[PDB]
């Protein structure tokens, strides 16, 4: 069909040609004239035109000033018109002598009718009607959308019509997909694979069990689906007799339930972060905290503070180093209560002196106090030292005096320093609050 059609049609050139523009059907159907007619609406903003020479070329020139698809077809010829209708033998029946019309099968889509129809003038006189009537391709694309069709694959070597299939959805509420065909200039399997990819992306069902048969590939362990987890927990109605224990009075006591919070948002720190502590014993706590402190972006500086060494000593030391982005008080780690007095805890005094030294050092950086099971998120053990919570006590007050100087407290388990390395960098720099 195509060979004989093209063969005979090779004589009409010199009289009429073809053009394909993406102008809206309104203006061109208004300004067409002198043996010029629209060969195929391929969208509300796309119309192929079949008109005589010296006016079809001027149609392209007008659309170049309309800043719209304007290409003089080098394959220009006669179709959808009368210059080809006269051949009621070669261009009407000789092309297709044998034909076997198919039944329902998978719904195809004819256009010269504007709807899905499989007549006997498809296998036989479809070209009779093609070189006679228009194509009304847009009407059939609307019918495709009406019959549930949205991804359009352009069987070609360059997008000219999927480009126009996207002006189908530039004014239609059913915005439809139009996988970008191999670009003008693309002719290799690298670009075909890039198309198969965007076909899958757009929604085209790809039988991937066909692309990988000649490859002789193997299946290897890959990560499973990352379920994006909500917190869908149903708290029971009769929890311990639907109350704390035995019934309820009109008054209501509050309680502290440590809720799993964020470890903070890790920001690359700067300046220095002082690991302020004692010097009595060697501390693996320091080596574990610092390994994520200079890796936090700052540098690590020790500040050996002694029991009531002075409300000022730490101040001039902090001024000696210079600007600090915050300090890590590791003086309240693995430290017994002096059995003389719980509130005479060596650390509490040094924490207070350090706080007021930063206040007097005009440094303005948030102080963090690492404590060793001073408190507990959950009763799984016994509070290692009730005196240590004293710091926590005054800690909850320090922020109400100096929000800039007080960062907070970071409780860590008794003995283990892994939690420091795992979280301190994010915790001290955390925007969680």
């Amino acid at each position: 069909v195509v060979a004989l059609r093209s063969r005979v049609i090779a004589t009409m050139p010199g009289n009429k040609g073809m053009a394909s523009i993406a102008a809206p059907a309104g203006e061109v159907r208004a300004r067409i004239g002198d043996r010029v007619e629209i060969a195929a609406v391929n969208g509300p903003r796309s119309v192929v035109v079949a008109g005589d020479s010296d006016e079809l070329d001027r149609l392209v020139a007008s659309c170049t000033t309309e800043c719209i698809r304007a290409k003089r077809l080098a394959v220009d010829y006669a179709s959808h018109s009368s210059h080809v209708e006269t051949i009621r033998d070669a261009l009407h029946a000789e092309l297709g002598e044998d034909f076997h019309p198919l039944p329902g099968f998978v719904p195809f889509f004819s256009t010269v009718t504007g709807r899905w129809t499989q007549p006997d003038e498809l296998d036989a006189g479809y070209w009779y009607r093609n070189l006679r009537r228009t194509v009304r391709f847009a009407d059939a694309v609307r019918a495709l959308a009406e019959q549930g069709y949205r991804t359009f694959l352009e069987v070609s070597a360059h997008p000219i019509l999927t480009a126009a299939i996207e002006e189908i959805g530039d004014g239609s509420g059913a915005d439809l997909s139009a996988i970008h065909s191999l670009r003008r200039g693309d002719g290799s399997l690298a670009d075909f694979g890039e198309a198969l990819s965007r076909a899958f992306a757009a929604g085209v069902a790809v039988d991937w069990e066909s692309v990988h048969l000649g490859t002789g590939a193997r299946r290897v362990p890959l990560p499973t689906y990352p379920f994006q987890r909500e917190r869908v927990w149903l708290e029971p109605k009769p929890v311990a007799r639907r109350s704390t224990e035995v019934d309820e009075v009109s008054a209501l006591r509050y309680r502290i339930e440590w809720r799993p919070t964020g470890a903070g948002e890790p920001a690359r720190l700067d300046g220095t972060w002082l690991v302020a502590k004692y010097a009595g014993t060697a501390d693996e706590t320091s080596t574990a905290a610092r390994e994520a402190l200079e890796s936090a972006g700052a540098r690590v500086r020790e500040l050996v503070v002694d029991a009531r060494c002075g409300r000022d000593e730490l101040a001039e030391r902090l001024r000696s180093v210079g600007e600090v982005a915050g300090v890590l008080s590791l003086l309240a780690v693995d430290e017994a209560e002096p059995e003389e007095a719980p509130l005479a805890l060596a650390s509490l005094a040094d924490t207070l002196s350090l706080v007021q030294a930063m206040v007097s050092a005009e440094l303005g950086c948030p102080l963090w106090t690492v404590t060793e099971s001073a408190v507990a998120t959950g009763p799984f053990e016994r509070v290692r030292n009730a005196a240590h919570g004293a710091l926590w006590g005054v800690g909850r007050v320090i922020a109400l005096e100096n929000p800039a100087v007080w960062g907070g407290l970071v409780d860590v388990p008794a003995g283990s320093v892994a939690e420091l390395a795992r979280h301190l960098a994010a915790v001290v720099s955390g925007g969680a609050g």
């Binding site: 029971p236 009769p238 929890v239 311990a240």
Partner: protein, 48 residues
């Protein structure tokens, strides 16, 4: 001590007091009561 399967089909439902709060006399047996698990093993235990 004979090979004799017991295949009971039940539904969890809710019988006693919520195990978290336990009970007064039914404290260690509340679990052994509200479990379709032992609703086939209890039978295979009594008969052997």
């Amino acid at each position: 001590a004979s090979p004799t399967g017991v295949f009971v089909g039940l539904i969890p439902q809710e019988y006693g007091p919520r195990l978290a709060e336990g009970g007064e006399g039914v404290e260690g047996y509340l679990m052994t009561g509200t479990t379709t698990s032992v609703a086939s093993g209890r039978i295979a235990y009594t008969l052997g």
